[PDB]
Structure formats: C-alpha cells, structure tokens
Amino acid sequence: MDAITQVPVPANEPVHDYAPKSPERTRLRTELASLADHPIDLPHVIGGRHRMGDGERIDVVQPHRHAARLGTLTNATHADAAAAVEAAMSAKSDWAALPFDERAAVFLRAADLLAGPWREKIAAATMLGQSKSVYQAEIDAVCELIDFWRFNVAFARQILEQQPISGPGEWNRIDYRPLDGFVYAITPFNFTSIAGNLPTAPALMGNTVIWKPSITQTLAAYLTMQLLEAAGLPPGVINLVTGDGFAVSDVALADPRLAGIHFTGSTATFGHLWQWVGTNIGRYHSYPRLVGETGGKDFVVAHASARPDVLRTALIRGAFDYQGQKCSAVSRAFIAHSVWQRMGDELLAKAAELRYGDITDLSNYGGALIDQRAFVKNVDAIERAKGAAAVTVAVGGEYDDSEGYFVRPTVLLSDDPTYFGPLLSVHVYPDERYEQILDVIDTGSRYALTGAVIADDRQAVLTALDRLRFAAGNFYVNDKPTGAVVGRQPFGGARGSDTNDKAGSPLNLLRWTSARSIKETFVAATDHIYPHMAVD
Template sequence: MINAIARVPPPQNEPVLSYTASSPERATLQAALQRMASERIDIPVVIGGKQLRTGKKDEVRMPHKHSHVLATVHEADASHVEQAIQNALTVKEEWSRMAFTDRAAIFLRAAELLATRYRPLLNASTMLGQSKTAHQAEIDAACEAIDFLRFNVHFAERLLAEQPLSAPQTWNQLDYRPLDGFVFAVAPFNFTSISLNLCTAPAIMGNVVLFKPAPTAMLSSWYVMELLREAGLPDGVINFLPGDGPTLGKAALTSPHLGGVHFTGSTPTFQSMWHTVGENIQRYRQYPRLVGETGGKDFIFAHASAAEDIDALATAIVRGGYEYQGQKCSAASRVYVPESLWPKLKPRLQEFIAELRMGDVTDFRNFMGAVIDERSFKKVSSYIELAKQSGAEANFVAGGDTDRSEGWFVKPTLVQLTNPRHRIMQEEIFAPLVGVHVYPDARFEETLRECDQAATYALTGAVFARDRKAISQVMDTLRHAAGNFYINDKPTGAVVGQQPFGGSRASGTNDKAGSMLNLVRWTSPRTIKENFAPPTRVPYPFMQG
C-alpha cells in the first residue's frame, strides 16, 4: 500500500519514426516483416487467459498477395461467448476494486512495450495482414495506439478527480463505478489502434470486456492481446473472441449482463446491433451504453479564394482520398471545386495521382497497398463500373483500373460528376475512389447546402480558402456536417489529445475517442454525501411561532 495521492506521468504524443532507407527502425521492421511472412501462426480463442482451439478454423491472408496465408484462426461460437461472460464476471469485482494507480500502471507499461519491443511486431502484422505501408502502420499501430494508452490513463485520472462541491459540515464525493456486467468491444479492420482502444478504454475504468476483432485484422489483434498479457493485464479482464460477427453478436447482445457496446464499423451493422438491444431492453440489468463510430462520406470543399493554394488543395485530395487505399472512415471521398479553380487543379491532381506507386507494402517505394479483401474489391469495382455506365454524367480524371490476379488492387480513381447527387457522391465506398463535383462560382452558397444535405453521414470534412469570410460561412453552414472539421488541411489524421475523433448523424454517437468524453461512457457514478453534523430534531426553524 502507498500512502499518497499519486499522479500518472503527463502524456505526450508518440513521435512518428521516419523509416528512411538508412534508419535503424527500417532495418528492425524489415526483419520483423521477413520473419512474419515466413511463418504461419495458430491464433486461438482466449477466455480467462486460457487458449482454446475450437477446430473451426479460418485463414489470415495478405490482401496484396492473397495466396499467402499468415495465420490460422480458431473461431468462437455462442457457447464461448457465454463462457467468456461468466468468466469475466468472476474477475470483475477484483479488477474494479484494484486501485486506479495499479490499473493505470498496466496500461502505461503496455505503452512503453509498444514504443519499444512491440513496435515492429504491431507494425509488421498491420502491414502484412491489413496491407498498410510502413508510414500508415507507424501512425496507427504504433503512435496512435501508444497515445490511446497514455492519454486514456491521463483522462481517467482527470475524470476521477472531478468531484462535487461540499457545503459546510458535509463531504460530497463521486465514486466512479464500472458499468454493470460486461462491455462488448467490436473492432474494425482498418485501424489497429482502434482495436486496442475499443477494448482497453472500458477496462481502464474498471470494466471487463469481450473483444471481438475483425476477421481481416486478426494478426495484429492477436499481437494486441499478447502485448496486454505481457504488460500484466489479469486473465479474464479482456477476453479474445474471433469468429462470425452475427453469431457472436447475438449471444453477447442478448445477454442480461450486457453493460455496454464499444463499436467501430459500418453504419448498418451498428444500427442492427442497436435494434437488437432495443428488442431486448427488458432483459438487461441496466440500460446498456451504446458507443459507436460508424461510416463517413467525408468532403473537401474548395472556395475560389484557394486559387493560390492549388498544390496544397491537390495534396489534401490525394493524401486524404488515397492513403491506405481510402479505407479510413475519415477519408476524403467527395470534393466540391469551383469552376474558376478546376482548370488549374485538374492537371495537378492527374500529375500527383500518376506518381503514386501501388503494390506490395514491403516495398517501401509504394504509396498504396491492396484493398482489404475480395468483398471490398467487388464493391469498389461495381462503383467504377457504375461510373463507366453513367455516360456524360461521369468523366474519369484518373484511374478506373483494377487487378485481382495477385492481390486486391484498385488504382487510385478520381471521377468528375456533373450530378452532385450521383451515388458516388452520396454512398460510402471505403476504397480509393473519389468523386469531384465542379460547381459554378456563383452557386457557392447553394453548393454548400448541397454538401450538407447530400449524404447521411457527418464524420469529417475540410474547407480550403483564404477568404476568412468564406471560411466562416462554410463552418457555419456545415456545422453539423462533420464532427471533425479541418481548415486548409485534409480531413484525415486526427491525433489523440489534439483532435478528439467522432461524428454524428449516420456516423455514430460522437463520443470522441481520444478524449475524456469517451471514458465518461464507461463509468456509472455514485454520489456519496457524508454529514459530519446530522440534525437531531425534526422541526425546522421557520416553524417557530
């Protein structure tokens, strides 16, 4: 026992390593890539710290070389969900009663392990299993993941320190209890850091978690579990359940012990989960907390005053639209450009896009890898075919080609669309396909309203302009169109502690991952009033005659 009011170390954002040709980090990463590519590991279900090999197996393949199998995964079923729930509940009381400083130390140790020895492991597994380049893996699986661990501990400390006022002769306190039951954490494929945050943020606040990783991010998710185990996380606090989403989801969401859902993924999936919770609302011991970051149809809106910033605008469109193959919920997927800028912007975009190399991510010269799987490849291919069949309504500015022979490769594609309500301007595609609508300069205000109303999503967006009045007008008209808004910058790349991330409308519950607002959702506060001088007589003074 320590007789002290301890303070966690002040967090700082993890520096991004460069991976230049002569750097030691590149050599270390390349060694990890070679080792992982040469082995085929066996990934089990993990419940209460025990590894279970169910016999029902799936395979982890490289998206950019889909014949190459990286791992075999054992899938959980509904019975394993129930087993995990019961196991988690047996360790919950001890975990929730552990001193915050002891819980915090586990996650701070995980951050340091990830900043050092686990850095090449998480980066390499993310590159091979999710087809990210070294830079995209570094800013995700290393830096953002480390930031989530360090900053969430810091945010938790700030939250616990938030206490009510006390009147004379009394002492009021808030006791930040975990939720009743367990938290069901359901992760996407596109960010290893999100997978880590989804399961660890509730755990930091004393909750127990059932972690369902994405089938197409299983390799990196396994190393996340290994990282937390080595950091000292007690068995059963986070249980690892790979398997079929609907099967596992139904078992978890209909359990009376469901305390909350921490989700990142598609809008239809989250809506389906919410529907299931609504249908079972009378079963639960408490009303479950539903936290979801879902889809996006993110925009870049250019004003005529950006004429002197064509290269910056073109860079934002290309980086924002094509980094990680456009598979970011924040990726720029629709662009609005005034007619006065288009003659200068179009050739710059064509030039920039033509320079992008695509291929195996272990070749550090490549800017892009492959889309995540065959399903994604078929989806984006259907939109490209739709554009080709749209006649004069659609004009290919760049790209439009696909190749599935070795990997799920889609060339960065830019399509000019005369109709601002074309499906490519409205629907989430989650691939390297960007739609651009060129509007008459005189229709600036009308086009702003179109941008606000065209899509059901409201995640990220950006404006490019020098005219401050125009910037103010865009910010005002599009105030509810983006939960993360950028001025003269691409709409991707939110940093923990700097740009809390999340959107509303069909983009989610906007609980802002990377801030204290998210952690509030994983606690059920109890108010405690202690009276040091309680009254000893019933009548009040006003009752005296």
C-alpha cells in the same frame, strides 16, 4: 498507501519516418519477414488461456498477396463465447478491486512496450494483414494506440478528481464505479488502434471485456493481446474471441449481465445490434450502454483562393491514403474552375502514377483493398460510374484481384454537384458560385463525417465554417480532412449522430463508469421540527 498520486503527463508519440538509412526501417524489415515466413494459429484468448476452438478454420492472408497466409483462426462457437463471458465475469472482482494506479500502470506499461520493443512487430502485423503502408501502420497501430493508452490514463485520472462542493458541516465525495457486468467490444478492420482501444478503455475503468476483432485484423489483434499480457494485464480481464462474431453476439446479447457494447464499424451492423438489445431489453440487469462510431464519407471544397498545390496534395492523400479505407476518406471534392485550371491535369497525372502494390516494398504508396467483398463493392462502383451519364472516369478505374485485391486510384469527373475505396469524385464549379455550392453541400449532408475548405481568403474560410456548421462533425481548413490525432481533434460524428462520447476524450471513459455521490453529515438534526412551524 497514503498519497494523492498524479499519473505521468501524456504527450503524443512521435511518428517515425522509416526513411532509408533509419534504424527503424531495418527493424521493420526484420519483423515483416518474421511474420510473413512463420504463419501461426490465431487462437481465442479466454481467461488467459490461448486456445483454438471447434469452429470453422478461416485463413488470414496478405490482402496485397492473398495466396500468402499469415495465420489461421477458428470461428468462435457458442461454447467459446460463453467461456469468454464467464472468464470476464470471473476476473471482475480482482480487477475492480485493484487500485486505479495499478490498473493504469498496465496500460502505461503497454504503451511504453509498444513505443519501444514491440513497435515494429505491431506495425508489421498491421502492414501485412491490413495492407497498410509503413506510414499508415505507424500512425495507427503504433502512435494512435500508444496515445489512446497514455491519454486515456490521464483522462481517467482527470475524471477521478472531479469532485463536488462541500457545504458547512458535511463532506461530499464522488466515487466513479465500474459497471456491473461485462462489456462487449466489437472492432473494425481498418485501425489497429481502434481495435486495441475499444476493449481497453472500459477495462482501465475497472470493467472486464469480451473482444471480437475483425477477421482481417486478427494477426495484429492477437499480437496486441500478447503485448497486453506482457504488460501485466491479468487473465480474463479482456477475452479475445475470433471469427465473424455471429455466435458471440448470440451468446453475449442474450446474457443478462451485458453492461455495454463498444462498437466501431458500419451503421448497418450497429443498427442490428441496437435492435437486438432493444428487443431483449427486459432481460438485462443493467441498461446496456451502446457506445461507438460509424463511418462516413468526407468532402473538400476549394474556393478560388485555394492554394493549388495544397489542394492537389490534400486530395491525393485524403482520397488515396490507405486505399480510401480510413473511417473517413475524401470521396467528393468541389473545386473552383480557376483552381482546376491550375492543378487539375497535375492531380490526374499524379493519381495515374501512384503506386499501389505489395507493402513490403516500401517504395509503394499503398496496398490493396482489405478482402474480396471490398474488392467486389469497388468494382460495382467503378462499373456504375462508367455506366452513369453524370460521371466520367478521368483517370484510373482499373482493377485486378489475381495477386491481391488491387483497385487503382480513380478520379471521376461529375457534372452534377449532386463503401470504402480509392475513388474520388470531383465536381468543378464556377468560381462565383462558391456560396451556392456550400448550400448544395449542406442540403446533401446526411453522411457527412468530415469536411474541409481550402482557401487563403479569410472571409471564404469563415463563410465555410459558418454555412457548413451543421453539415459535418469535424471541419478542416487548408488540409485534408483525414488523420485525427488523440487529444487534438476529438468529437464530431455524422450529422444527427449522438457520438460526443466516442473514443478520444474523457467522455468515452465516463460511459464505462457509474458515478455515485457520498455525503457525510457531521452534526445532523436531532429534532425533526422546522423553524416555520413555530407559533406564531
């Protein structure tokens, strides 16, 4: 080929509503039945071979109906992890040798397969295994994943045209090489889009990968692998290993060819990996690149000029969409007294009526918590709230793990302005102490991922944007601080983090390259003496 080609221009994928009478609702019912009725083995996918391993069998179930099995995986053994690392290294040369456009076409094809014939299949696997309502599944497993793929192809293509200046008599170029060695992607339960992106973003740039998805997301992870295969992903470029990850990390973190880790999950797990890499630093051929993001909890401050209906809705969605389990959910709200007088009883009444249940009933707002450990952590929190003098349970606080891991939307009233779940703490503050509340928030700002101000008053909005500039990584005005859309709300991260390079911008993709400069000089010097040396 003699060409300087351009990739298709990305736009965000439209979100389907699955309203009654819509055709996508019919298709979704069909896929929900198909997956829930035919539970399957969920194998490792190594070198293109789908195989169960010799580790412990672990059932993947519907969290909202936990006796209902969706499939069964095997806990990866050391042998399975070693096979995945070898397959990733054996696939590297043919994959890195493919031209960029052929690598990009796999992910553009995967995007259009997910937008069209696989759409409800992947949305249903996510609803079932992760206990997401259809809306929560549509924005995540379908739209966000599609946009990661289309946008990362466009961001990669933008990176490749960033080229230097050529002086007279020379030509300077930059080549964005892939890394040496394999990348290890470790992905969380809560987003099928993150789970698909972490391994595929480095692959787009010519790397190969071993991918360890969260057990409770593995139905959608495996269907994602099938989809990628259907798009033409060559065997071994991504290798899926199932289970709790412990034997995989034993192998991967000991291998000298480890080039990077792409991680999203808890700070505790990230810290363990970072320590391990550091301890082993002397054995790696390359300095391993550790990239990703950890969670946090978000706050909302409503000024006396807040619209009460906007605030009520932002709080209900922000705290209770996907049962509070989004990488960030609204956990703490600070509301001016005069606004609480206008919307406080309505918030508690709507929270008390909010329906959580089996998400194959599309009328439910949401489902259950992801697994028994999450449920235990939520019960411990609610019982701590009931026993703490500073907090009252205003609505909710009931829980029952008999059918599914169900916890009710809970609103706590906290008299003192000083784990994921459907819990919201509200502190009501006198209207004239808005600036003082902003100070309190800033002083308590360690695990602050996102913040929002609700205020029609422009001075109040600017005061919040300024006073809390360093107190949160993403800031929202008159909306809930949840729901970031690829291309639209990149960046942030908790205060003090170094996560500018997380997914959603070209800076992530650059982490999976090692740029070299190439300089050709056309008529270089043929005498070494310099002008200053002359006599004189």
